[PDB]
């Protein structure tokens, strides 16, 4: 299903980053996708099921969550973080600021696992120096 990806803050993702981005708390708060209940039923998924998000720019696995802040029809919400930033639009249009918000993505259910914080970062393949 093609949806519009919106990203930003959450009181829980703020609590998590100031508690520790190495903690499980952070995966639970930021490695998620918020959806309207009708959209979850349209996709055939329940809270706790995982979703594969793919865009022109990347892909990520996040845990589906029912939005307590209702979304417009066709929109989903991933909190700011490295999972969301696998998939949002990097280009700045010569402003220095990327397009973190409102990005066309494709979402589909998946049985793959959510990558924890250090495992997610290895996707970028850091070479020492």
């Amino acid at each position: 299903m093609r949806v519009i990806l919106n990203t930003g803050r959450t009181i829980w993702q703020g609590q998590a980053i100031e508690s520790g981005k190495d903690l499980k708390m952070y995966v639970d708060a930021a490695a998620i996708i918020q959806m309207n209940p009708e959209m979850m039923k349209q996709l055939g998924i329940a809270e706790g099921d995982n979703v594969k998000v793919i865009s022109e720019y990347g892909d990520v696995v996040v845990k589906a969550v029912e939005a307590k802040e209702p979304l417009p029809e066709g929109m989903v919400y991933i909190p700011m973080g490295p999972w969301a930033n696998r998939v949002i639009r990097p280009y700045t249009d010569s402003t220095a600021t990327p397009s973190f918000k409102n990005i066309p993505v494709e979402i589909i259910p998946t049985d793959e696992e959510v990558l924890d914080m250090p495992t997610l970062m290895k996707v970028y393949g850091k070479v020492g120096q």
Partner: peptide, 11 residues
């Protein structure tokens, strides 16, 4: 924390 908060292409 640009590792958490920059886009894929910058990482």
């Amino acid at each position: 924390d640009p590792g958490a908060h920059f886009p894929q292409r910058a990482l």
